[PDB]
Structure formats: C-alpha cells, structure tokens
Amino acid sequence: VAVSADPNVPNVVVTGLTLVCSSAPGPLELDLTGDLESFKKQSFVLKEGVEYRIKISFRVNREIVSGMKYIEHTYRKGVKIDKTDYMVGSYGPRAEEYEFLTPVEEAPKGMLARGSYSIKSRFTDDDKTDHLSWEWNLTIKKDWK
C-alpha cells in the first residue's frame, strides 16, 4: 500500500495522429510514443482538395480530464499561416484507447496552396497541461504519385 517505486505512467498518453483519408494509397500515421524529431525529416503527402479528418489516438488511464483541446498551428516556408483549435471534450479513464476525430477538413488546392507545410500540434486541456507536443509536415501536391 505504500509504494516503493512510482509507476511513472502519465494519466494521458497521446499515442498517435492519423489522417483518415479514403483516397490515399498508403498509411498516414504518426506513432507518437516513439521518436518525435524524425517526423521533421519526413512528410505526409496529400493530393490537393482531398477530404480528411485528423484522428488523435490517446489513453486516459487513471483520472477524468476536462476540456481537452487539440491545437494545430500550421506553417509555410517558415512562417505561421494558420491556427486551429479543436474541442475534444471531457474524458474519463478507460483501459481502451480513445480516438478523437476532427470535423472533415480538406487539403488545400491551387498554386499558392501547394507546397510544404509544418504543423506544430499540442494536445492540451483546461489546466493547459502539455499532454504532448510534436511537429509534423504535410506536403500538398497535384497528385499522390
């Protein structure tokens, strides 16, 4: 009953990001329990105009977390061109992982919209806790290729 060692398992473990896209020829998942820096040297390719949702896979292990929020600030050629907040909600503990889907979004289209992007994601809550922060890239092209 008096524990000699701490379990060290965070109450909230953000496990993954996935772009749910029917048109995509291959996988589009970020294993967030792994190495996060390597994501900056890779990218997700999305054909212009295609619809997709962003699935944030997380585990709420022990306590109820209120007002969960998933924030994305997107960058193009070094400068921030977008800021989007998504309301995830209040989640109680569970053995089974949670999968939060954002509303249907579209990949941008046009000459001025194609190119390389860089998203700085933050999964947070009411007490503004940093459950996880990571950077991933999205390259918008004419075709999947």
mmCIF file of C-alpha atoms in Angstrom:
data_model
loop_
_atom_site.group_PDB
_atom_site.id
_atom_site.type_symbol
_atom_site.label_atom_id
_atom_site.label_comp_id
_atom_site.label_asym_id
_atom_site.label_seq_id
_atom_site.Cartn_x
_atom_site.Cartn_y
_atom_site.Cartn_z
ATOM 1 C CA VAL A 1 0.000 0.000 0.000
ATOM 2 C CA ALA A 2 2.976 2.389 0.431
ATOM 3 C CA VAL A 3 4.638 2.090 -2.965
ATOM 4 C CA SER A 4 8.427 1.731 -3.123
ATOM 5 C CA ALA A 5 8.513 2.870 -6.743
ATOM 6 C CA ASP A 6 6.349 5.198 -8.853
ATOM 7 C CA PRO A 7 4.693 3.629 -11.936
ATOM 8 C CA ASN A 8 5.585 6.738 -13.977
ATOM 9 C CA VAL A 9 2.672 6.241 -16.388
ATOM 10 C CA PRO A 10 1.179 9.663 -17.256
ATOM 11 C CA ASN A 11 -2.584 9.962 -16.804
ATOM 12 C CA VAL A 12 -2.868 10.913 -20.501
ATOM 13 C CA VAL A 13 -0.691 9.203 -23.097
ATOM 14 C CA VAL A 14 -1.134 10.608 -26.640
ATOM 15 C CA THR A 15 -0.304 7.564 -28.761
ATOM 16 C CA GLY A 16 -0.876 8.676 -32.329
ATOM 17 C CA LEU A 17 -2.012 11.005 -35.121
ATOM 18 C CA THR A 18 -3.694 9.602 -38.196
ATOM 19 C CA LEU A 19 -5.046 11.339 -41.309
ATOM 20 C CA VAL A 20 -8.216 9.443 -42.202
ATOM 21 C CA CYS A 21 -8.232 9.701 -45.993
ATOM 22 C CA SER A 22 -10.091 7.219 -48.245
ATOM 23 C CA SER A 23 -8.232 8.345 -51.386
ATOM 24 C CA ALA A 24 -4.681 7.940 -50.004
ATOM 25 C CA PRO A 25 -2.783 4.936 -51.498
ATOM 26 C CA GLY A 26 -0.905 4.228 -48.285
ATOM 27 C CA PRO A 27 -0.647 4.776 -44.500
ATOM 28 C CA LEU A 28 -0.673 8.224 -42.873
ATOM 29 C CA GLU A 29 0.052 7.561 -39.184
ATOM 30 C CA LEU A 30 2.465 9.112 -36.654
ATOM 31 C CA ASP A 31 3.463 6.814 -33.772
ATOM 32 C CA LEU A 32 3.656 9.427 -31.001
ATOM 33 C CA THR A 33 5.086 7.064 -28.362
ATOM 34 C CA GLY A 34 8.222 6.907 -30.496
ATOM 35 C CA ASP A 35 10.792 9.404 -31.702
ATOM 36 C CA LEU A 36 9.172 12.787 -32.485
ATOM 37 C CA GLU A 37 12.159 14.605 -34.122
ATOM 38 C CA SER A 38 12.396 12.192 -37.013
ATOM 39 C CA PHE A 39 8.999 13.442 -38.158
ATOM 40 C CA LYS A 40 10.617 16.738 -39.160
ATOM 41 C CA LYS A 41 12.798 14.889 -41.682
ATOM 42 C CA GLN A 42 9.788 13.057 -43.255
ATOM 43 C CA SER A 43 6.333 14.172 -44.503
ATOM 44 C CA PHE A 44 2.726 13.164 -45.281
ATOM 45 C CA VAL A 45 1.738 13.702 -48.924
ATOM 46 C CA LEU A 46 -1.826 14.741 -49.612
ATOM 47 C CA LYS A 47 -3.329 15.400 -53.045
ATOM 48 C CA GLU A 48 -4.883 18.847 -53.344
ATOM 49 C CA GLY A 49 -8.543 19.213 -52.445
ATOM 50 C CA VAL A 50 -8.968 15.767 -50.819
ATOM 51 C CA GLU A 51 -11.079 15.470 -47.699
ATOM 52 C CA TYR A 52 -9.616 14.047 -44.497
ATOM 53 C CA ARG A 53 -10.055 14.030 -40.737
ATOM 54 C CA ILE A 54 -7.276 14.112 -38.107
ATOM 55 C CA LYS A 55 -7.548 11.242 -35.630
ATOM 56 C CA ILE A 56 -5.782 11.750 -32.301
ATOM 57 C CA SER A 57 -5.285 8.443 -30.508
ATOM 58 C CA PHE A 58 -4.817 8.820 -26.737
ATOM 59 C CA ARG A 59 -5.239 6.910 -23.455
ATOM 60 C CA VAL A 60 -6.839 8.411 -20.319
ATOM 61 C CA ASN A 61 -5.590 5.925 -17.700
ATOM 62 C CA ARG A 62 -6.493 6.977 -14.146
ATOM 63 C CA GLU A 63 -8.283 10.360 -13.758
ATOM 64 C CA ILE A 64 -11.085 12.282 -15.583
ATOM 65 C CA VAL A 65 -9.605 15.034 -17.863
ATOM 66 C CA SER A 66 -11.832 18.029 -18.603
ATOM 67 C CA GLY A 67 -11.985 20.325 -21.542
ATOM 68 C CA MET A 68 -9.464 18.541 -23.671
ATOM 69 C CA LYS A 69 -8.332 20.583 -26.703
ATOM 70 C CA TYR A 70 -6.295 19.680 -29.827
ATOM 71 C CA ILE A 71 -4.476 22.647 -31.326
ATOM 72 C CA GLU A 72 -2.649 22.902 -34.672
ATOM 73 C CA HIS A 73 -0.663 25.953 -35.877
ATOM 74 C CA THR A 74 0.405 25.402 -39.493
ATOM 75 C CA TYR A 75 3.484 26.952 -41.110
ATOM 76 C CA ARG A 76 4.547 27.530 -44.746
ATOM 77 C CA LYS A 77 8.136 28.476 -45.615
ATOM 78 C CA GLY A 78 8.993 29.248 -42.035
ATOM 79 C CA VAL A 79 6.042 31.468 -41.194
ATOM 80 C CA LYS A 80 2.800 30.633 -39.425
ATOM 81 C CA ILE A 81 -0.161 30.874 -41.792
ATOM 82 C CA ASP A 82 -2.893 29.103 -39.704
ATOM 83 C CA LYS A 83 -4.115 28.392 -36.118
ATOM 84 C CA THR A 84 -6.890 25.851 -35.429
ATOM 85 C CA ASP A 85 -8.308 24.687 -32.073
ATOM 86 C CA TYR A 86 -10.461 21.551 -31.858
ATOM 87 C CA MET A 87 -12.703 20.737 -28.878
ATOM 88 C CA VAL A 88 -12.058 17.147 -27.774
ATOM 89 C CA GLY A 89 -14.077 17.247 -24.537
ATOM 90 C CA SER A 90 -14.129 15.609 -21.094
ATOM 91 C CA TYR A 91 -12.776 12.100 -20.945
ATOM 92 C CA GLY A 92 -12.842 9.653 -18.055
ATOM 93 C CA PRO A 93 -10.315 6.797 -17.537
ATOM 94 C CA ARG A 94 -10.537 3.604 -19.578
ATOM 95 C CA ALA A 95 -8.473 0.579 -20.474
ATOM 96 C CA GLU A 96 -9.449 1.098 -24.158
ATOM 97 C CA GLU A 97 -7.758 3.840 -26.144
ATOM 98 C CA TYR A 98 -9.671 6.884 -27.322
ATOM 99 C CA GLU A 99 -9.789 8.107 -30.883
ATOM 100 C CA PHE A 100 -10.843 11.757 -31.360
ATOM 101 C CA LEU A 101 -11.845 12.640 -34.919
ATOM 102 C CA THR A 102 -11.855 16.300 -36.036
ATOM 103 C CA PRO A 103 -14.562 17.541 -38.392
ATOM 104 C CA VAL A 104 -13.994 16.768 -42.084
ATOM 105 C CA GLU A 105 -11.242 19.010 -43.430
ATOM 106 C CA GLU A 106 -9.963 19.448 -46.982
ATOM 107 C CA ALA A 107 -6.361 19.588 -48.179
ATOM 108 C CA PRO A 108 -5.750 22.986 -49.810
ATOM 109 C CA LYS A 109 -5.955 23.487 -53.624
ATOM 110 C CA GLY A 110 -4.215 25.831 -56.030
ATOM 111 C CA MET A 111 -0.762 27.157 -56.971
ATOM 112 C CA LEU A 112 -0.469 29.272 -53.854
ATOM 113 C CA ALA A 113 -1.687 26.324 -51.740
ATOM 114 C CA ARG A 114 0.604 23.537 -52.946
ATOM 115 C CA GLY A 115 3.943 23.161 -51.254
ATOM 116 C CA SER A 116 5.434 22.087 -47.926
ATOM 117 C CA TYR A 117 3.750 22.783 -44.596
ATOM 118 C CA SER A 118 4.807 22.162 -40.981
ATOM 119 C CA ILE A 119 2.273 21.675 -38.216
ATOM 120 C CA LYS A 120 3.078 22.237 -34.561
ATOM 121 C CA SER A 121 0.441 20.189 -32.747
ATOM 122 C CA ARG A 122 -0.395 20.460 -28.993
ATOM 123 C CA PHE A 123 -2.871 18.109 -27.209
ATOM 124 C CA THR A 124 -3.913 20.037 -24.088
ATOM 125 C CA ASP A 125 -6.755 20.710 -21.573
ATOM 126 C CA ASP A 126 -8.475 23.095 -19.091
ATOM 127 C CA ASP A 127 -5.402 23.372 -16.835
ATOM 128 C CA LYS A 128 -3.340 23.933 -20.011
ATOM 129 C CA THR A 129 -1.283 20.745 -19.477
ATOM 130 C CA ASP A 130 1.097 19.671 -22.251
ATOM 131 C CA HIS A 131 -0.014 16.037 -22.707
ATOM 132 C CA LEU A 132 2.133 16.089 -25.906
ATOM 133 C CA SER A 133 3.642 18.488 -28.348
ATOM 134 C CA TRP A 134 5.071 17.476 -31.739
ATOM 135 C CA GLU A 135 5.933 18.761 -35.232
ATOM 136 C CA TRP A 136 4.918 17.014 -38.453
ATOM 137 C CA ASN A 137 4.994 18.012 -42.096
ATOM 138 C CA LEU A 138 2.249 17.984 -44.802
ATOM 139 C CA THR A 139 3.254 18.354 -48.467
ATOM 140 C CA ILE A 140 0.337 19.260 -50.756
ATOM 141 C CA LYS A 141 0.759 18.086 -54.357
ATOM 142 C CA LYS A 142 -1.134 17.872 -57.697
ATOM 143 C CA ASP A 143 -1.224 14.086 -57.444
ATOM 144 C CA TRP A 144 -0.405 11.360 -54.898
ATOM 145 C CA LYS A 145 2.320 9.982 -57.237
#
